[PDB]
Paper text:
Glyceraldehyde-3-phosphate dehydrogenase (GAPDH) is a highly conserved enzyme involved in the ubiquitous process of glycolysis and presents a loop (residues 208–215 of Escherichia coli GAPDH) in two alternative conformations (I and II). In the presence of inorganic phosphate (Pi), GAPDH catalyzes the conversion of D-glyceraldehyde-3-phosphate (G3P) to 1,3-diphosphoglycerate (BPG), accompanying the reduction of NAD+ to NADH. All the structures reported in this paper have four subunits: O, P, Q, and R. Each subunit contained two domains: the C-terminal catalytic domain and the N-terminal NAD+-binding domain. Two anion recognition sites, “Ps” and “Pi”, bind the C3 phosphate of G3P and inorganic phosphate, respectively.
Two novel G3P-binding forms were observed in the ternary complexes WT.NAD.G3P and C150A+H177A.NAD.G3P. In these structures, the C3 phosphates of G3P are all located in the “Ps” site, while the “new Pi” site remains unoccupied. First, in the P subunit of C150A+H177A.NAD.G3P, the oxygen atom O1P of the C3 phosphate forms hydrogen bonds with the Oγ atoms of Thr182 and Thr180, as well as with NH1 of Arg232. However, it is the O3P oxygen atom that forms hydrogen bonds with the same amino acid in the Q subunit. The second difference is the orientation of O1 and O2 in G3P. In the P subunit, O1 of G3P forms hydrogen bonds with Nε of His207, and one water molecule, while O2 of G3P forms hydrogen bonds with water. However, in the Q subunit, the O1 of G3P forms hydrogen bonds with Oγ and the amide nitrogen of Thr151, while the O2 of G3P interacts with the amide nitrogen of Ala150. The G3P of the O subunit of C150A+H177A.NAD.G3P is present in hydrate form. We compared the G3P-binding form in the wild type and mutants, and found that after mutation, the catalytic cavity is increased almost 10 Å3 in C150A+H177A.This is helpful for G3P to move.
Author numbering:
A (entry chain R), D (entry chain P): 1 to 333
B (entry chain O): 0 to 333
C (entry chain Q): -1 to 333
The structure:
């Protein structure tokens, strides 16, 4: 399979295309579905507030984009069942709208002529992949799969290394995270969630996330062993995840950092840093997660020990590099 | 006089309408609110405000009402104004703050729904349009639907009126450096047809069209067609500033311009004056529509050819709301 | 009425708010002198116009050597060395030390050498009496001359830790505060002392930041000495901050039980508030508490007999902390 | 002359070095003077909040940086007259501290053994160069020259084009500009300038600038014909300049836009756009100024006409590209 439709050409949907070109995937996006015109999609693709100008030529006609000299159809169907995927023969849908995050909802893509769906968010109790953690669980019979959230892709590799080296008995996560499209520009209704209604660039806003709660889908041994949440803050992209764990062994900071370093060695998904970086330094990361040995903290009172480990993530472009790794393998099975 | 008000669109402007009415102990009673959400969520937004802080009065709710300072306010959720049941609590004057009924044709739906008069919190085409303390004497008993134009009009008009009256404005162009609002985007993505409006508002200087100068003739007839302008939307949450560059009808000094302005702001509850070195956060919470800033006045001249730059601040939320309320109170007593 | 005469050293974010709060509560303390590094004109400007709290609620004027605030004169000095401040000229006895440059008993001694009698330091100042009001203020006595009120973070952390310790025991814990940026940080990337991360553009980054709030908690709650660690993530909000604590407690608990204990500890407690509303950081701006526990963020994670308890409290690290500083000051002045 | 020293390794000073490497200049930076350690300078060079990771290797020693393999001496002399520029033979000093903005002040570098100084700011009535407006005025005997401000580099090529095509009779400028290190993070004393004392990322802050007032140093025919100021706003970099003029001829918008387009043709310093860009789209620009045809406004009543023209500028990297063009020419005289 090498024909891709993008449903939802948003922050994630546009960067998917950017990253496919940057890595020279043999995948071809043949169709984009969204809610707008080729003119406006072209403008958005050409000019990006977080990553700067598109590195390839971009033009449009009434019905397509022309990206690096190649044509991509543009549709504007708000219900997925009506999307004409058959027209250009889109095989794998990268479902990036947020409105089809369940196998039953995303079935609509298959009913409409697609063969597979890769959902760019948590999508309940379905197969959910963090690349370089559990991508060996994918087979040729999977049709609709999830790559969870950016926060999952941050948390999972760090949890996996800790669990493998020391065991995690129980833990809780807080991610201090860049604001996203699901939040509000000015104070006003945003569905049912009271905190999501508040001005995002003017507030620290507590925010629910299932990344720890559903980690069992990616690291079966940790099912039910973690909880967590987010604090959304006023940065445009670039985020950090802290995990406080009770481990299966007594450890030093140095031991923990070394075990992590080893986990990140020749691991294109998971990086390491012992530099004094800040969030803007992760913008444009090609990792899903970058463990930061400078923030490791072991609090020990006799037999009791709390371990705080911290990893950075570009919740836009970093997460996208993982989505694309999963896509490229999904495409071959 | 009319005393019962309905608010359509309990948004940034709608909520501050209620706050200001209670603040000035108005005899006007808000008896109903129409929006698209639950009392619960409206109560949460009313209690907790990112720009102005905690609501200064008690807030509770029921399944179909808010209870504000102990007084019950009906809450409806009709997306079409014609369907709002304004007669249930006898709402007489609707303060129309949704942005979706900005014409006479559109807003007369509230009259079909049982109201008596409508005051629109935005420009609404060529209808009677009032900047209080500029042209509020043009209101009369036969006006049924009226506009108070934009925050930018309320900032620009008193400054332009004073310049027009003292010196003449032959021609001018405005630029307002303005706080971002709800019509903009949190992250880069579609926002109707306007390409700039699609960009992340708190991360960019964004050029932005406004009719404030173009439609100024509704408020100052002598300046009809004599002004143009635009906005640069920037990352501040509220508090904005408007610059006007004019060819005036007289050779002037900065001191003469500033004195003329100071005079126009004397005994004027709508239009303030400052010669302090203020910045935008100092205007948040202002009870004026516009505050002229003498420290920014600039006269550029080569021979007879003279450009005059005058600058006024405005709290595009609360300050504008104070103008809306002054107009509302007068409108209720005609 | 005790009419102690106060001097403020460092008329900065905290120093200016100290005056605001004293006037707001109609304190019997008289502020008679201020020392900074600048002119009365500039201090008058900054006092009148505040980016976080708006217009000063009283009149402000200046002369060549004073501020006039609501009609009352306050002498202005500009002595970069505290020993040279003429605190005796207007009789300033209690100095509120808000510069960041005298954060020890030995450094703040200079105010006593200059003729003051007591110093209250608006920051951690090592192993000296360190007070969080309504946690350990009953340790002050008539013999104290130099005392600390620790950091805003300590004032947020301590009341929540004290309630938890008193109700359930805390065996061990780690804190992270997601916190507004302050004057120690940088506007644009550039050198800022030795702290590399402090060099980075504060309104454009999430910046990890060290704080002693957890590590030194034993000054305030002696039973918890050595049992807590923690750090901050500084973020682009101008004021208003939140502190999370993850604890192993001495007994198994439910979220309700933790929230009820905290509720009880906040009852009739002018220093420590409670909320169960879904507030965000701007809702804490101008708080008159040092800390507001947020029951909505309580989380119990348990596997077998292993339990992690996460408890969360807001704080306005400027005005909120200042209200604690003032309560301490008022008591410290009556002894 | 090919050996350079940088005084002030700040936003401008570090980007000077970045741009010299980027263009593979033959200029050799042999020394840097600042107030801090090599360790801290290395960290700042490597990690940049506006422009991301340094594209070359960076290490340090107790008295040096090692950048792309090459040693650069680091001094910490707060008085320029004490900088030991003769040790590594620095001939031309790029003066980027802001503390030596006059001939009399920057003479110190020549006393310290340098031969020439290029000041990264306005510096009074001395030779002042906006590259591709008046760089022809640089002379073999000049030893101290200025490149004015970022705002001047934005305004001048627009003013030159208008003046050449139509005449500017009189004009006034407002730049809506990114905040800079002369401002304050929190409200507090900032020398004598009261507006500069205010929290820069939380305010619109009027700010005086000489860009227009001193335009006659760059375009002598416009001496005394312009005034202007800035409004500093909460964006980290990327700015815009509006100019309102009385021109010597009646014009259409198309005519103004066409004249500006011609002036930008084969002009490495002056770009054009008719795209609906916003400030983030200018970040990383290699122009001193980019005229934006989309904002052109002609306001006419009878025989009176006001003409508003608008150009974008990256007040950091864009201006630095102009500084380096000027330095390259200067070094060969
Ligand atoms: N932004 C992040 O940090 C991030 C990271 C990882 C995963 N995700 C996930 O990826 C998905 C997309 O997030 P995003 O931040 O790009 O959101 P976004 O809001 O930027 O983009 C959504 C896009 O989908 C379009 N859209 C909405 N409804 C549609 C419909 N019915 N049909 C077609 N197009 C539709 C919108 O026009 C928009 O272009 C979400 O499920 C989100 O949870 C986001
Ligand atoms: N924010 C400002 O600076 C400002 C200043 C002056 C005037 N205005 C004008 O006031 C109006 C409101 O602006 P705002 O900033 O308060 O916008 P907002 O988006 O904050 O509020 C709009 C409110 O109306 C509600 N709504 C939308 N469609 C509706 C419908 N069909 N029926 C009932 N309720 C509906 C929304 O739920 C929201 O609560 C606009 O016309 C705007 O131009 C805004
Ligand atoms: N969030 C907060 O801002 C906060 C909260 C609690 C405690 N504190 C503490 O309070 C103190 C002040 O913090 P701030 O935020 O008000 O800092 P600030 O930088 O806003 O204020 C410092 C003031 O001290 C003056 N100053 C510096 N050196 C001086 C000297 N040698 N003599 C006289 N004046 C001098 C400065 O000019 C400035 O006005 C620090 O110790 C800080 O840790 C700050
Ligand atoms: N940032 C901009 O947008 C911009 C654009 C054009 C020109 N400039 C100008 O360039 C100059 C530098 O601006 P910047 O934004 O890089 O400022 P900055 O504050 O970022 O850098 C100044 C550097 O000089 C150092 N320094 C200060 N005093 C010193 C001394 N006495 N000796 C040696 N080093 C010293 C500082 O430690 C810092 O590294 C100024 O003249 C400024 O007007 C700035
Ligand atoms: O509420 C759902 C998400 O947690 C919000 O943002 P996101 O979907 O872009 O990650
Ligand atoms: O709690 C935080 C401190 O009081 C922060 O202080 P600071 O102003 O010294 O950064
Ligand atoms: O424009 C006047 C000041 O010099 C401020 O900023 P800048 O010097 O970095 O341009």
């Amino acid at each position: 399979m090498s024909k891709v439709g993008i449903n939802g050409f948003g922050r994630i949907g546009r960067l998917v295309l950017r990253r496919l070109l940057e890595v020279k995937s043999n995948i071809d996006v043949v169709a984009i579905n969204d809610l707008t015109s080729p003119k406006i999609l072209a403008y958005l693709l050409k000019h990006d507030s977080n990553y700067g100008p598109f590195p390839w030529s971009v033009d449009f006609t009434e019905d397509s984009l022309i990206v690096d000299g190649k044509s991509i159809a543009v549709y504007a169907e708000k219900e997925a069942k009506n999307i004409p995927w058959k027209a250009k023969g889109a095989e794998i849908i990268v479902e990036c709208t947020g409105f089809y995050t369940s196998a039953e909802k995303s079935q609509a893509h298959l009913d409409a002529g697609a063969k597979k769906v890769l959902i760019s968010a948590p999508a309940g109790e379905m197969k959910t992949i963090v690349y370089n953690v559990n991508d060996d669980t994918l087979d040729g019979n999977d049709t609709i799969v999830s790559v969870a959230s950016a926060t999952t892709n941050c948390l999972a590799p760090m949890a996996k290394a800790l669990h493998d080296s020391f065991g995690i008995e129980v833990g809780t996560m807080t991610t201090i995270a860049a604001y996203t499209g699901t939040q509000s520009l000015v104070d006003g209704p945003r569905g049912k969630d009271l905190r999501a209604s508040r001005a995002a660039a003017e507030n620290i806003i507590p925010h629910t996330t299932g990344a720890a709660k559903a980690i069992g889908l990616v690291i079966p041994e940790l099912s039910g062993k973690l909880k967590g949440h987010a604090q959304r803050v006023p940065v445009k992209t670039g985020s950090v995840t802290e995990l406080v764990s009770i481990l299966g062994k007594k450890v030093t900071a140095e031991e923990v950092n070394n075990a992590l370093k080893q986990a990140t060695t020749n691991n294109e998904s998971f990086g390491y840093t012992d530099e004094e970086i800040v969030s803007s330094d992760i913008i444009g990361s090609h990792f899903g997660s970058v463990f930061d040995a400078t923030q490791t903290e072991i609090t020990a009172v006799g037999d009791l020990q709390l371990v705080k480990t911290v990893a950075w993530y570009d919740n836009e472009y970093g997460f996208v590099t993982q989505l694309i790794r999963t896509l490229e393998k999904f495409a071959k099975l």
